RNA sequence: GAGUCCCAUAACCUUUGUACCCCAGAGUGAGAAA
């Protein structure tokens, strides 16, 4: 299935969060559970563009939470590791999938 | 571009009129536009001959519409005076038809003309 | 036989979109798409249904070759309600209009004609029948009217030309759906008058095989016509074996 | 309709046995069980056929 | 400012052309009177278009 | 070596990009042909990159002509210029038509066209799936536009004209009789309704149209003045004496007076009958005008109204001309349109009608010159018998 | 009938407003059908009488 | 309790009035006048 391939792409990110201590393992699991439902929704039949917008919004919110726990816990503006740029790259990847699937919707473009 | 089309040249016209004269002797000729329409409707017409000088020409331009629908060869000859003479009647004839008959004595001559008309069209 | 006031018991035919009117004599009929008029002066039958007045058109076998095919008993006609059909060599609405009746409002008929004079009556008929798209073009160059035609479930060829095997093939490749229908009416005199009618029919059948059209059936149209046979075939691109 | 009006019932009965109506006709051989869907219609003649078939 | 006016010129020609194609369908209009109406509507449509650029020119103070 | 594909829809031009190239040595195998049918298999071959819909109906016909002639329309030049990359090596374009190839090469030297059976197969798949390949992009509806374009393309070549149309003649006549039936019927009801209030006037003015007008003036019979007498005297003429009669009978009658509401309907209903008659007169002029412009020969020979009827019986001016002379005689033999010596003129006139009809039908701009000499010829026969 | 009065010709369908006669979804339908129509042009003489 | 749903808002027949007809019909297809 396509879904599992996309989920495993997240693992190196979730590993970095625990190692940096920003998120606990239980918290990290909850993020993956929400992604698992999203990443599945996109690849299954009946998907609409709104599913892409929801997932993009969710990933954007996770980026904010990481950015604040960085200064709160690590006390560093940018942690030099994979976690810094994974989300921003992922959100871009979601857009490229969305526009290919639904080139009609001008709002998404 | 002209309404009367195709118009047979001199050499072909001589051969067409010859067949008409032979057909008239054998009772295989229907003379006049009204008869010609009746033959096409009954689909017994080997081919139709028309006078390109018919005055006015439109009076017989209904036959091609019948001819093309039913897939019957047709041709225009320059003279109505000559066509009437070959037909054997004592008046001008603007349209004539060769009735279908596979038992005819002039079958080979008819088909010889029929191919040439088909090439012209 | 079928006089003006005479009345008939109309019951359906084995082929969908074809009906039989019984009586002292039997008539093949198809339901009128545009009630209240006749395109070539055929007889018409009116039935009162709950009450709306529907109208049936009498199909004369002697004028339309396809009709003569029904009466002789063609096993399979790919023309049926709700199917796109391409009619090549539509001289006028004598036979296309009947085909349009069979397909019904849902289906469409692509009538193709070359000569302008019979076409003018084709166009005037087409206005009364929305489901007919008349294409005044030469069937020998299908590329010219490719914009106008989509996939067509069946291709019906009444064209009287010596080289039929090419026109039917070229339009078959471009527009016929795989496993689609092909119905060709063959006139022995037109293709080659020098040889007997049987040889011509055998020759045309072989051409269709070379063009990947597996031929299913041949029927001779007598007594309705002399030296005519309708060959029904399927377009099998996968394999004709 | 299940009423099966006697006029329509007799109507179909003359088409089942149409071989005996006129001694010169002699149609083909067929059974023609009554169909489950049928209608009765009146022919309409062309105005050009006023004298021939009216 | 000559370059801008050139675009206005070519603009005003083609907009009229397409407006003729619309309001006409596939087919030319046989009636002479109706054709006059189409020419009017093009003109009126073109004037209402032309008037806008007069309004636009006001915005730019530096140019003549 | 195919990389870009050009497909033309009635709505517009569609350009695809070929992701994978199907096996060519095996093109005739069953597997590589089935995949064209299967959408899942086909979508892996090509992907849409561009689509430029036509501005309107007019442009669709113009390009539909150009594509037929193998030319490059300005819209087609635009879409290719935006899509095909500039290029020793030439970008390959797949096109259905070979005649279009050289024109594209002229405009674009850097593109090489292909139209072998490989190109035809990919074009076949595009046509098969149609709108499904556009990924929801708005392509209108391909079935409707084909119907509009198809009629547009055909009638452009054959050069149809509104001048030839005769359906107006068939339809105006169907109004002229229907109006006369209704104008008679409704006027008969005006007679009864106003008859109750005053039955005598129905006897005084038998002409129904005048009665509607006269009723419009003398609403209530009690209104009787010398000035009113002059007014109603102006209506029609006093020669009949109805003007003096109406006043005397108005003074003295057994008509029971009806309410103002009932009076209101009689005049309004009478006003309705007036409009139908006035419209019918206006139409009768229109039919006469159109018959001259459509069938001047036939109209001149027998008449505008009768010739219009004959066109209706035959069903169309084309059908009438196509008929034989004997058939035309019986076409109007139920209403005696053309009508022992009497019989001969009918049949003689019957032929001459067919003669005029043919001239009218197949003539782009029929004149009345031949109709006249034909009628004079029939006349000369008339005195002879 | 009221449609014929407001707009006489398919050409007029583009600028004519049918809101009072037809709802929104119907009126756009005739506007689109107007441009792709199969029927032929008519003279003002025909139009006046049809009005 | 009980067929509106085969138009009693109608069909068919008779009488009267109006306008016509007393030929053949997929009409025939070369005489007519002297």
From Swiss-Prot, chain B:
* Keywords from the named record: mRNA processing, mRNA splicing, Nucleus, Ribonucleoprotein, Ribosome biogenesis, RNA-binding, rRNA processing, Spliceosome
Which GO BP annotation is one of this protein's?
A: spliceosomal complex assembly
Question: Which InterPro entries did the record assign?
Answer: eL8/uL1-like, H/ACA_rnp_Nhp2-like, Ribosomal_eL30-like_sf, Ribosomal_eL8-like_CS, Ribosomal_eL8/eL30/eS12/Gad45, Ribosomal_eL8/Nhp2
Q: How does it assemble?
A: Binds to the C'/D and B/C motifs in U3 snoRNA. Component of the U4/U6-U5 tri-snRNP complex composed of the U4, U6 and U5 snRNAs and at least PRP3, PRP4, PRP6, PRP8, PRP18, PRP31, PRP38, SNU13, SNU23, SNU66, SNU114, SPP381, SMB1, SMD1, SMD2, SMD3, SMX2, SMX3, LSM2, LSM3, LSM4, LSM5, LSM6, LSM7, LSM8, BRR2 and DIB1. Binds to the 5'-stem-loop of U4 snRNA. Component of the ribosomal small subunit (SSU) processome composed of at least 40 protein subunits and snoRNA U3.
Subcellular localization(s) per the UniProt record: Nucleus, Nucleolus
PROSITE patterns from the UniProt entry: RIBOSOMAL_L7AE
Briefly, what is this protein's role? Common component of the spliceosome and rRNA processing machinery. In association with the spliceosomal U4/U6.U5 tri-snRNP particle, required for splicing of pre-mRNA. In association with box C/D snoRNPs, required for processing of pre-ribosomal RNA (rRNA) and site-specific 2'-O-methylation of substrate RNAs. Essential for the accumulation and stability of U4 snRNA, U6 snRNA, and box C/D snoRNAs.
Cited CDD domains: SNU13 (cd21104)
Annotated transmembrane regions: none
Spell out the Pfam families in the cross-references. Answer: Ribosomal_L7Ae
Swiss-Prot record, chain C:
EC number of this enzyme: 2.1.1.-
- List the GO cellular component terms: 90S preribosome; box C/D methylation guide snoRNP complex; nucleolus; nucleoplasm; small-subunit processome
**Residues where Omega-N-methylarginine is found:** 3
Region: Helical; residue ranges are: 196-228
Annotated compartments:
Nucleus, Nucleolus
Where's the Glycyl lysine isopeptide (Lys-Gly) (interchain with G-Cter in ubiquitin) crosslink?
65
Query: Outcome of residue 9 to D?
Result: In nop1.3; thermosensitive allele showing a decrease in histone-glutamine N-methyltransferase activity upon shift to restrictive temperature
Q: Where is this region: S-adenosyl-L-methionine binding?
A: 94-95, 113-114, 138-139, 158-161
Keyword annotations from UniProtKB, A to Z: Isopeptide bond, Methylation, Methyltransferase, Nucleus, Ribonucleoprotein, Ribosome biogenesis, RNA-binding, rRNA processing, S-adenosyl-L-methionine, Transferase, Ubl conjugation
| Family recorded in the similarity comment | Belongs to the methyltransferase superfamily. Fibrillarin family.
Q: What does this protein do?
A: S-adenosyl-L-methionine-dependent methyltransferase that has the ability to methylate both RNAs and proteins. Involved in pre-rRNA processing by catalyzing the site-specific 2'-hydroxyl methylation of ribose moieties in pre-ribosomal RNA. Site specificity is provided by a guide RNA that base pairs with the substrate. Methylation occurs at a characteristic distance from the sequence involved in base pairing with the guide RNA. Involved in the biogenesis of the 18S rRNA.
The identity of this protein, by name, is rRNA 2'-O-methyltransferase fibrillarin
- The protein's organism comes out as Saccharomyces cerevisiae (strain ATCC 204508 / S288c)
* Organism phylogeny: Eukaryota, Fungi, Dikarya, Ascomycota, Saccharomycotina
Curated annotation (Swiss-Prot), chain E:
Q: Could you say which residues form the signal peptide?
A: none
Q: Domain of life of the organism in this record?
A: Eukaryota
Its subcellular locations are: Nucleus, Nucleolus
Describe the subunit structure.
Component of the ribosomal small subunit (SSU) processome, or 90S pre-ribosomal particle, composed of the 35S pre-rRNA precursor, the U3 snoRNA, and at least 40 protein subunits. Component of the PWP2/UTP-B subcomplex composed of DIP2, PWP2, UTP6, UTP13, UTP18 and UTP21. Interacts with U3 snoRNA. Interacts with MPP10.
> What protein family does this chain belong to?
Belongs to the UTP6 family.
Q: Kindly give any further remark recorded in the entry.
A: Present with 7520 molecules/cell in log phase SD medium.
Known role? Component of the SSU processome, a pre-ribosomal particle required for the maturation of the 18S rRNA from the 35S pre-rRNA precursor.
UniProt name for this protein: U3 small nucleolar RNA-associated protein 6
Q: To which species is this protein native?
A: Saccharomyces cerevisiae (strain ATCC 204508 / S288c)
Chain's gene name: UTP6
Full-length numbering of the shown residues: 267 to 330 of 440
Curated annotation (Swiss-Prot), chain F:
Alphabetical UniProt keywords: Nucleus, Phosphoprotein, Ribonucleoprotein, Ribosome biogenesis
Q: What is the effect of changing residue 355 to R?
A: Reduced growth rate at all temperatures
In this protein, which residues make up the domain named Nop? 294-385
Q: Which residues carry this modification: Phosphoserine?
A: 316
Chief location of this protein within or outside the cell = nucleus
Where is it found, in Gene Ontology cellular component terms?
90S preribosome; box C/D methylation guide snoRNP complex; nucleolus; nucleoplasm; nucleus; small-subunit processome
What are the recorded GO MF terms, alphabetically? mRNA binding; snoRNA binding
Compartment list = Nucleus, Nucleolus
One annotated GO biological process:
rRNA processing
Main role? Required for 60S ribosomal subunit synthesis.
**Family under the similarity heading:** Belongs to the NOP5/NOP56 family.
Listed under subunit, the entry gives: Interacts with NOP1 and NOP58. Component of the ribosomal small subunit (SSU) processome composed of at least 40 protein subunits and snoRNA U3.
Give the miscellaneous note.
Present with 13500 molecules/cell in log phase SD medium.
Q: By what name is this protein known?
A: Nucleolar protein 56
- What organism does the record attribute this protein to? Saccharomyces cerevisiae (strain ATCC 204508 / S288c) (Baker's yeast)
Shown portion of the complete protein runs from 3 to 415 of 504
């Amino acid at each position: 299935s396509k879904t599992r391939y996309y989920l495993e792409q997240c693992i190196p990110e979730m590993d970095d969060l625990v190692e940096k201590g920003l998120f606990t393992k239980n918290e990290v699991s909850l993020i993956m559970k929400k992604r698992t439902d999203f990443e599945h929704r996109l690849n299954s039949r009946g998907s609409s563009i709104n599913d892409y917008i929801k997932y993009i919004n969710y990933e954007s919110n996770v980026n904010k939470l990481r950015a604040k726990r960085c200064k709160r816990i690590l006390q560093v503006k940018k942690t030099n590791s994979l976690s810094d740029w994974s989300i921003q790259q992922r959100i871009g990847f979601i857009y490229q999938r969305g526009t290919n699937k639904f080139p009609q919707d001008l709002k998404f473009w | 571009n002209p309404k009367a089309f195709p118009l047979a040249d001199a050499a072909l016209t001589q051969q067409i009129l010859d067949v008409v004269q032979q057909a008239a002797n054998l009772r295989q000729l229907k003379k006049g536009a009204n008869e010609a329409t009746k033959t096409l409707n009954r689909g017994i017409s080997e081919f139709i001959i028309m006078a390109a000088d018919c005055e006015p020409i439109e009076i017989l331009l209904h036959l091609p519409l019948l001819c093309e629908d039913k897939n019957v060869p047709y041709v225009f000859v320059p003279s109505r005076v000559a066509l009437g003479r070959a037909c054997g009647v004592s008046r001008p004839v603007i349209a004539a038809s060769i009735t279908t008959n596979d038992a005819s004595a002039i079958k080979t001559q008819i088909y010889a003309v029929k191919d040439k008309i088909e090439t012209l069209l | 036989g079928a006089r003006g006031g005479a009345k008939v018991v109309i019951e359906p035919h084995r082929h969908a979109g074809v009906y039989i009117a019984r009586g002292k004599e039997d008539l093949l009929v198809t339901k009128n798409m545009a009630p209240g008029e006749s395109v070539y002066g055929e007889k018409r039958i009116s039935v009162e249904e709950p009450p709306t007045k529907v109208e049936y058109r009498v199909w004369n076998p002697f004028r339309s070759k396809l009709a003569a095919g029904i009466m002789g008993g063609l096993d399979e006609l790919f023309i049926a309600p709700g199917k796109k059909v391409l009619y090549l060599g539509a001289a006028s609405g004598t036979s296309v209009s009947h085909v349009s009746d069979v397909v019904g409002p849902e289906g469409v008929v692509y009538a193709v004609e070359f000569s302008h004079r019979p076409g003018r009556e084709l166009i005037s008929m087409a206005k009364k029948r929305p489901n007919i798209i008349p294409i005044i073009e030469d069937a020998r160059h299908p590329q010219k009217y490719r914009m106008l035609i989509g996939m067509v479930d069946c291709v019906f060829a009444d064209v009287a030309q010596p080289d039929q095997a090419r026109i039917i093939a070229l339009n078959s490749h471009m527009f016929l759906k795989d496993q689609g229908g092909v119905v060709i009416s063959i006139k022995a005199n037109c293709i080659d008058s020098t040889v007997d009618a049987e040889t011509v029919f055998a020759r045309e059948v072989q051409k269709l095989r070379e063009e990947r059209i597996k031929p299913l059936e041949q029927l001779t149209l007598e007594p309705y016509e002399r030296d005519h046979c309708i060959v029904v075939g399927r377009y099998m691109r996968s394999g004709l074996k | 309709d299940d009423n099966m009006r006697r006029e329509v019932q007799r109507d179909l009965l003359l088409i089942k046995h149409r071989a005996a109506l006129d001694p010169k006709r002699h149609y083909k051989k067929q059974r023609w069980e009554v169909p489950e869907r049928f209608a009765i219609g009146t022919i309409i003649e062309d105005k050009s056929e006023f004298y021939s078939s009216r | 400012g000559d370059i801008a006016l050139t675009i206005f010129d070519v603009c005003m020609k083609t907009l009229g052309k397409h407006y003729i194609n619309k309001h006409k369908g596939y087919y030319a209009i046989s009636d002479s009177k109706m054709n006059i109406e189409l020419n009017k509507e093009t003109l009126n449509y073109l004037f209402s278009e032309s008037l806008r650029y007069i309004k636009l020119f006001d915005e730019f103070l530096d140019l003549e | 070596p195919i990389e870009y594909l050009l497909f033309e829809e009635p709505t517009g031009y569609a350009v695809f990009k070929v992701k994978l190239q199907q096996d060519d040595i095996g093109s005739r195998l069953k597997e590589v042909q089935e995949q064209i049918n299967d959408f899942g298999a086909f979508t892996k071959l090509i992907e849409l990159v561009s689509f430029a819909p036509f501005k309107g109906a007019a442009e669709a016909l113009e390009n539909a002509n150009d594509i037929s002639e193998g030319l490059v329309s300005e819209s087609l030049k635009a879409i290719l210029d935006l899509n095909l990359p500039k290029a020793k090596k030439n970008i390959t374009l797949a096109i259905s038509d070979k005649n279009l190839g050289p024109s594209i090469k002229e405009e674009f030297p850097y593109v090489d066209c292909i139209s072998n059976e490989l190109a035809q197969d990919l074009i076949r798949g595009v046509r098969l799936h149609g709108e499904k390949l556009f990924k929801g992009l708005q392509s209108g509806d391909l079935e409707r536009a084909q119907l509009g374009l198809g009629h547009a393309y055909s009638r452009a070549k054959v050069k149809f004209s509104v001048q030839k149309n005769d359906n107006h003649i068939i339809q105006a006549i169907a109004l002229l009789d229907q109006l006369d039936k209704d104008i008679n019927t409704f006027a008969m009801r005006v007679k009864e309704w106003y008859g109750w209030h005053f039955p005598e006037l129905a006897k005084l003015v038998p002409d129904n149209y005048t009665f509607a007008k006269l009723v419009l003036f003398i609403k209530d019979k009690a209104s009787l003045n010398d000035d009113s007498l002059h007014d109603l005297a102006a209506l029609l003429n006093e020669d009949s004496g109805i003007a003096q009669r109406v006043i005397d009978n108005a003074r003295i009658s057994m008509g029971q007076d009806i309410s103002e509401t009932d009076m209101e309907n009689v005049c309004v209903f009478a006003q309705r009958v007036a409009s139908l008659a006035d419209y019918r007169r206006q139409l009768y002029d229109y039919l006469c005008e159109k018959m001259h412009t459509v069938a001047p020969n036939l109209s001149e020979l027998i008449g505008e109204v009768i010739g219009a009827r004959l066109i209706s019986h035959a069903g169309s001016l084309t059908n009438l001309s196509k008929q034989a002379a004997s058939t035309v005689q019986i076409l109007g033999a139920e209403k005696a349109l053309f009508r022992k010596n009497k019989g001969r003129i009918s049949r003689y006139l019957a032929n001459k009608c067919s003669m005029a009809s043919r001239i009218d039908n197949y003539s782009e701009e029929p004149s009345n010159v031949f109709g006249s000499v034909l009628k004079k010829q029939v006349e000369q026969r008339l005195e002879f018998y | 009938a009221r449609i014929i009065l407001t707009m006489g010709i398919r050409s007029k369908a583009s600028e004519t407003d049918l809101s009072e006669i037809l709802p929104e979804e119907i009126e756009e339908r005739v506007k689109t059908a107007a441009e792709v129509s199969m029927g032929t042009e008519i003279t003002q003489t025909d139009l006046d009488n049809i009005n």
